[PDB]
């Protein structure tokens, strides 16, 4: 029974991942074939770049603005920078914008989406000049809607680029997010790659490879069938007609970009993900903040599940993959929970050692593929993501399920999960307190657990050596620290 369950877990985890790898590779081949036909110095889609932010680091906001300005795309109509706030502290963003761009900061007294006349011409007069708006703080959706209306008042603008206030774009990110829109009349959105640059912490180092996997594999797989989720945010291109069609139902809903993407998909429109457009953002360095962020992400995903399933019904035989993935995530969560619960109350050393060895092996295979794809030996740190998942995501999923003092609603379930895991480990240790070197099964269990501990210790020591030698830092991170030292 235990062997059958472990084999089922192994196949269930390593078969969908292999299928996703194959689909992402085929999406990469399709996009490469599309790009190989792109004429040199191609600029046919007029683009307005939208930056929506709220009290970002003055250094990182300046880096984002400079990365936008230092972009090689030849057809950029305008830059729209919307700031969720007109308070005294929110003027720092305007000052940074004036440092990097013109003195066209506007402070309307109203939020554009909460007015009888929502046209961008009510708060703007010239579409040629880059614009900065200081609008009252309502949310990411309201600032994004103001940016959409400011971009839509120029009839010559064909597409729109959404980036975060902290995204350091590559010199060809805009070109590679806007090119796929012209390769298919039914493609109304493109998702770009987001890369974590601040790999100076054990959590951020693993979150960087989690982002790499979840973008490359898990979005090329969706883009093969052209049903990518969560487009926009750090980097994403939207056609102007589709946003003109879907902005009102999206803003009048009773910012995660999930509902915007589902509004695109519910109308039968294709969405691709390009791995050749890269924008650099950061990740939380704190475990607890990561826990609350993942709780919010899981709450958003669980809220937009019926709408996602309905969206993956408008595609005749496509969208079956989207529905299968939506069911697979739930089935995987409950499979992991059931496996841990079963092997935790039985206190069988053979089963626990087999489970940890199989999980380590499958994560080693996944990390090997990640290293091959990224050409980076640091992708083997992803074997340590098992701890991050088991100790931050499962509490996050349970909290999202249960919440849909302020400390209790955020961390009580996490602390209870930690206490339960500790109690299960202690019970398994005290229920199997014996030594028998004459038994081959006990020898196998002890040697397996000791080898697993030695492996994880060696990986941790390698990470520590890299941290001391600053070998874990991305080149952009080294550049950013060097720039910060002297401002």
């Amino acid at each position, epitope marked *: 029974s235990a062997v059958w369950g472990i084999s089922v877990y192994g196949v269930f985890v390593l078969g969908f991942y292999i299928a996703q790898i194959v689909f992402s590779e085929f999406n990469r081949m399709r996009l490469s074939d599309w790009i190989s036909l792109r004429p040199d*110095n191609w600029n046919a889609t007029r683009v307005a770049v939208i930056i929506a932010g709220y009290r970002e680091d003055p250094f990182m906001f300046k880096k984002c603005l*400079e990365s936008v*300005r*230092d*972009s*090689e795309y*030849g057809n*950029v*109509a*305008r830059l729209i920078c919307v700031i969720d706030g007109d308070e005294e502290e929110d003027l720092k963003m305007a000052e940074i914008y004036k440092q*990097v*761009y*013109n003195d*066209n900061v506007k402070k309307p007294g109203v939020v554009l989406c909460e007015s009888e006349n929502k046209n961008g011409s009510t708060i703007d007069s010239d579409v*040629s*000049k*880059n614009i900065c708006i200081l609008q009252p703080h309502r949310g990411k959706r309201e600032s994004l809607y103001t940016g959409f209306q400011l971009a839509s008042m120029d009839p010559s603008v064909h597409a729109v680029v959404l980036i975060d206030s902290d995204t350091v774009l590559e*010199k060809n990110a805009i070109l590679e997010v806007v090119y796929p829109l012209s390769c298919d009349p039914n493609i109304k959105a493109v998702a770009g790659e987001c890369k974590i640059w601040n790999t100076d912490t054990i959590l951020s180092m693993l979150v960087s490879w989690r982002y790499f996997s979840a973008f490359n594999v898990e979005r090329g797989a969706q883009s093969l069938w052209k049903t990518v989720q969560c487009v926009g945010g750090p980097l994403g291109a939207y056609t102007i007609d589709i946003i003109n069609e879907i902005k009102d139902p999206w803003i009048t809903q009773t910012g995660d970009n999930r509902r915007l993407t589902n509004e695109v998909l519910m109308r039968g429109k294709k969405i691709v993900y390009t791995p050749f457009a890269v924008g650099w953002s950061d990740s939380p360095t704190n475990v607890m903040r990561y826990i609350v962020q993942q709780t919010r992400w899981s709450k958003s995903w669980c809220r937009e599940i019926w709408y996602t399933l309905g969206s993956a019904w408008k595609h005749g035989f496509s969208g079956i993959y989207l529905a299968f993935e939506c069911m697979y995530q739930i089935m995987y969560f409950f499979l992991v929970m059931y496996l841990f619960s079963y092997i935790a109350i039985k206190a069988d050393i053979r089963a626990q050692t087999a489970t940890v060895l199989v999980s380590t092996l499958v994560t080693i295979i996944k990390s090997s593929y990640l290293a091959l794809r990224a050409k980076n030996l640091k992708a083997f740190y992803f074997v340590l993501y098992t701890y991050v998942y088991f100790f931050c995501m499962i509490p996050a999923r349970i909290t999202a399920m249960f919440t849909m003092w302020l400390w209790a609603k955020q961390f009580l379930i996490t602390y209870m999960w930690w206490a339960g895991v500790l109690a299960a480990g202690v019970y398994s240790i005290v229920d199997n307190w014996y030594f028998d070197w004459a038994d081959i099964q006990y020898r196998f269990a002890l040697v397996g657990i000791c080898s697993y501990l030695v492996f994880v210790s060696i990986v941790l020591v390698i990470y520590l050596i890299g941290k001391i030698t600053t070998w874990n830092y991305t080149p952009l991170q080294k550049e950013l620290i060097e720039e910060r030292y002297l401002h």
Partner: nanobody, 120 residues
């Protein structure tokens, strides 16, 4: 951004000149680097422009004869004027335009806020 241009002098009829404009200060790959000519009297005459990353826009009077290149690594650009004529020898400016106020191509000397010193 400080622009300094070198190269230029007396040329006897048909020939070739190479003017190098070096920029002190970072360029943003969206700043249109141009060359403007000022004959004795008259006004500033646009002869060439190109964005720092990629592009190209040559004046009608110089189209075909003048070649515009950008190093993009040493922060210098070069203008090669081949098959010279007596009517274009006075002054070249190699101005710069920043895509801060707007991204619109100008071709007018007013839109260039950085200029060099006159070079024969």
């Amino acid at each position: 951004v400080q622009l300094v241009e070198s190269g230029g002098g007396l040329v006897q009829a048909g020939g070739s000149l190479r003017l190098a404009c070096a920029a002190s200060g970072r360029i943003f790959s969206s700043d249109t680097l141009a060359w403007f000519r000022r004959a004795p009297g008259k006004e500033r005459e646009f002869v060439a422009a190109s964005r720092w990353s990629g592009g190209g826009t040559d004046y009608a009077d110089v189209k075909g004869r003048f070649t515009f290149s950008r190093d993009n690594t040493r922060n210098t650009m070069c203008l090669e004027m081949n098959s010279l004529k007596p009517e274009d020898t006075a002054v070249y400016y190699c101005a710069l335009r920043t895509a801060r106020d707007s991204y619109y191509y100008t071709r007018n000397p007013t839109g260039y806020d950085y200029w060099g010193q006159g070079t024969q």
